[model samples]
Target chain A: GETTDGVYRVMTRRLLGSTQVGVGVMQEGVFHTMWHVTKGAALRSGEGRLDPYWGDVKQDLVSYCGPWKLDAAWDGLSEVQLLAVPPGERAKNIQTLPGIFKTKDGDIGAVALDYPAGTSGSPILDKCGRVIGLYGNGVVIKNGSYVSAITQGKRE
Target chain B: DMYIERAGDITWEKDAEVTGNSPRLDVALDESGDFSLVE
Candidate 1:
């Protein structure tokens, strides 16, 4: 049966396809979602206030944007882990995986293309071309079965 | 604030008597990260 408005709970994981087809599943949530599982960066401001005469280094502002696919829809019911590979090392396991990233502000880890300047990543689509709230967390990590505020709201 | 320099839009061409109903063309740019980035 088709989902009805008012209140509906999601059950059964839908099979995903090669290209993202707009099925319009769960889209509501207080999300701290991340993209680019293995590769991403957090922009940060310059160090120390080196006098106003020198002009505040607005360059300190950090941001990351890159071309990302609308992959998994967590439905806010689980903790999605993000995997990253450094310059030299590669990921340990080689299996098809899906994940998201969450970062705080003023962090400088990985960086997406065109950071702090022109938005390099696909700036238009969220999940599947929709608007999503942005959370400013710099510290990023990976874990499993993490439920978000959006998922909790739907529980009731 | 992130702004879209371009986006998917439907166009109509009278030559072929076709009315384009938003067949968004996927633009491939910024090839990085896992192929399955979103999941």
Candidate 2:
């Protein structure tokens, strides 16, 4: 059966940053996620290899993670929009009403949200929040406090 | 969303080696629909 003109949207009860595609083997049991959005890497080229070095990666981008599931990859079903979440703001964190528009242009316009940086996570209510997009891939987070103890740099 | 109204049938088998009985069973669902199975 075909749907009427009205859109059928799904809602979720989570803020962006507060929830993320869980990653990292060690921090897996701790923080739900980790981001590497620092100055040097954000502005510099070839910042870190393999892992997202702190100060090099931004965790607020929706494209930061996933092969986000889609309805269909062909027949115009191959489309998904993203929300522009600013640095430091919660990705899944509520407060901002994020949305994506599916365009006939084959280009998904990700609506920007008020995800400012350094913001902490708590709780909020989002009645119309259902996953409508896919997170990209290869993005990773390494512990800033622990990289690897070098024998040459061992102070002990 | 549940109620009762119907029509159907059923059958049975017999063996003579043990006791010799052909217990034939015939069920009429329209008038005999009084069975609890409808519920």
Candidate 3:
């Protein structure tokens, strides 16, 4: 049945070909929801919406910047963890898998977590609660997860 | 003063979408544990 307004809680997880679509996080001083472009699968799906083609759903998702300045620079010493609000559960849960740095690929960081399957597109935070990067994948074990951070640094 | 910067249930989709509907995108954005999305 289709979900009705004010109805029971429902999380519609879209299953598409070769893509894992999910949500985006909003930043304090930015507009639009920030997400992982690789995901959302077919942004407009060639439909008619001007969203996917905006290069946002293509690049780093959106201008929605979260706390920590949406940084790409990791301290290399800060312990990493993931915050997830997956399907079904309302209360946000923390999956503090031992995250360590691997390699830097483009704007994304190669990370190896226990792989919190279904947590792709979630923010990867440091021990001090800084928005260091974003959780990438869950297909593999060694390079299972990818963190999207930046080398361009400068913050307060 | 910390916020996740989104308004939807986890990931906003058809099911989670509605007029003025909302969801928390963060559990805590600071050490004080400030969060976005109103419950």
Candidate 4:
């Protein structure tokens, strides 16, 4: 039944192709979402298609704009975390992860995790509570889950 | 101060499209966490 908008608790689905939820943000004029899950898998797929026509090429599956001055530099030392405060509310749901760092690719970032998954398109922040990066892939781990890697929010 | 809300459980599709092409000032933070417009 379609109910009218009033004070009501809601159950939501945060799935995109998979049960996992990743974070994203607006940059320049494009909206970027996670494009890949595994480091090796991304390369393997990217290498398999070397054409620019984009007709038969495999794109990073999981896959921005904005007014805020989004930070591009990471100290690579400050411990960061996640938080979500619904618009029009003061109560925020904050989740503290170990901290994220630069990956070998020099562009990808990741965090240590021991959980089932993360929400897609969630924002990752620095200690000062500034938006730093976003969760690239959602639910990177499940049973005995361990690390969550991400893509840089800054465009090079 | 601004407020944020979860996006799911509701759909915004079928809504009017909004676009902006105007200029917005870029900002930078100093070591002490002070903000300044990037000029």
Candidate 5:
């Protein structure tokens, strides 16, 4: 209830031949999402753009495809914190881990990652299920060959 | 950064429906958590 901002909905895509994620938050009637500088560049330069099927859905998507900025919108629940499980307890409680919600246009039999794959931006939520941060996908390449995409948080 | 794009109505088809009996094709999630066309 109170911590709802920690919950989030994410999207993933291929840009310039790389896998990237887009993290979005629900605000006043719009879904706002962000992309990194490189992807932002592709969108601005017209080399790429977010696939509207996901971002541009029911509620108009307010997209922030730009350089990093300090997000003043962050509140107390804006960080990644996993619940601690006590060791050697008789019956350990099953904690509710933060999760990903795949809306409308959804998924497959793809492999699950060690941690949730933010191949499409994943939401890092707090106890209250509100969105605090959106995951970002970083592409690693060598010799013009694709290596991997790393997932991390992008605040506000 | 403050660059923003409004995914206006008609920009993306929201009520997009796929028959449960259609051919087994996959819908991939884009970096933003949205679904792209048949891939």
Candidate 6:
């Protein structure tokens, strides 16, 4: 869909950490997935990647130690809208209330929504469509962590 | 916002056989009447 620009779903099998999965978005250029998803596959271990609309697997992953570094031919961050779920079975779909971005230590942070079991590393973006912090992991709040990393390097 | 959308029926849990069975979680609909992310 036109709405899906920077967003991506990734799977990773960390060398020692085991396999994990979750949602993420692109920033600066690098594909930013939930930290938990790529923690295992960090540095070097198993493997991971995300699916794009035209290709089966195109967006290569990074060290993924945290929110990840930057690099992308397409600047998904520039997209006007967030990702949307395709119509699915009613039982399987997640129904949630309007979640609010909670602050910690008086800082912008993760959100509080009806997050489900499988949504551990889900990205919490504003309806206005601004990329926010990560979800799950007790909402640890990446804050500016993701943005900071991508600046160190750009995806080539 | 998760700008990642699926062109096909690529829902979470369906990739069990491959990719380590990663969970493709979901989000509820917004006022747009589509299964879009919540603000």
Candidate number with greatest TM-score: 3
Model 1 residue A18 lDDT?
24
Reference-based lDDT, each prediction: 0.18, 0.19, 0.32, 0.32, 0.28, 0.30
Given the true complex, what DockQ would model 5 score?
0.03
Tell me the native contact fraction for each prediction.
0.00, 0.00, 0.00, 0.00, 0.00, 0.02
Interface RMSD of 3: 17.3
What DockQ do the predictions score, one after another? 0.02, 0.01, 0.03, 0.02, 0.03, 0.04
Q: Report the number of the highest-DockQ candidate.
A: 6
Q: What is the TM-score of chain B alone in each candidate?
A: 0.16, 0.16, 0.18, 0.34, 0.28, 0.21
Better of 1 and 2 by lDDT: 2
Predicted candidate 4 versus true structure: per-residue lDDT over A1-156, tens digit per residue = 222211111112333332223333333323333333221111111123111111101223221122223455445554455433232332223444343332222333455433323343345556454555544342223233344443343333
Question: Model 3 over residues B8-32: C-alpha lDDT tens digits?
Answer: 3322122221111111121112222
- B23 Cα displacement, candidate 3 (Å): 33
In Å, residue A34's CA in model 6 sits off its true spot by: 2.5
Q: How does residue A9 of candidate 3 score in lDDT? A: 15
Tens digits of per-residue lDDT, candidate 5, A1-156, equal 111221233322443432323334434333334443224332321233332223222211334333222232223222222211111111111112222222244321111122323323333334343433333332212232211111222334
Clashes of 5: 30
Q: Which TM-score does chain B of candidate 5 obtain?
A: 0.28
Name the docking class for model 4.
Answer: incorrect
Candidate number with greatest lDDT: 3
Which lDDT tens digits does candidate 3 get at residues A82-116? Answer: 44445334424343323332322222233443323
TM-score of chain A, cand. 4: 0.43
lDDT tens readout by residue for model 2, A46-156? 232222222112222111112211122212222222222222232232222222222222222121222222221111112232233222211111221111000000001
Q: Please give the lDDT score at residue A36 for candidate 1.
A: 24
Off by over 4 Å in 1: A1-68, A93-137, A140-156, B1-39
Docking class of 2: incorrect
**DockQ class, candidate 5:** incorrect
Residue range B1-39, candidate 5, lDDT tens digits: 112222111111222221111112233446553433342
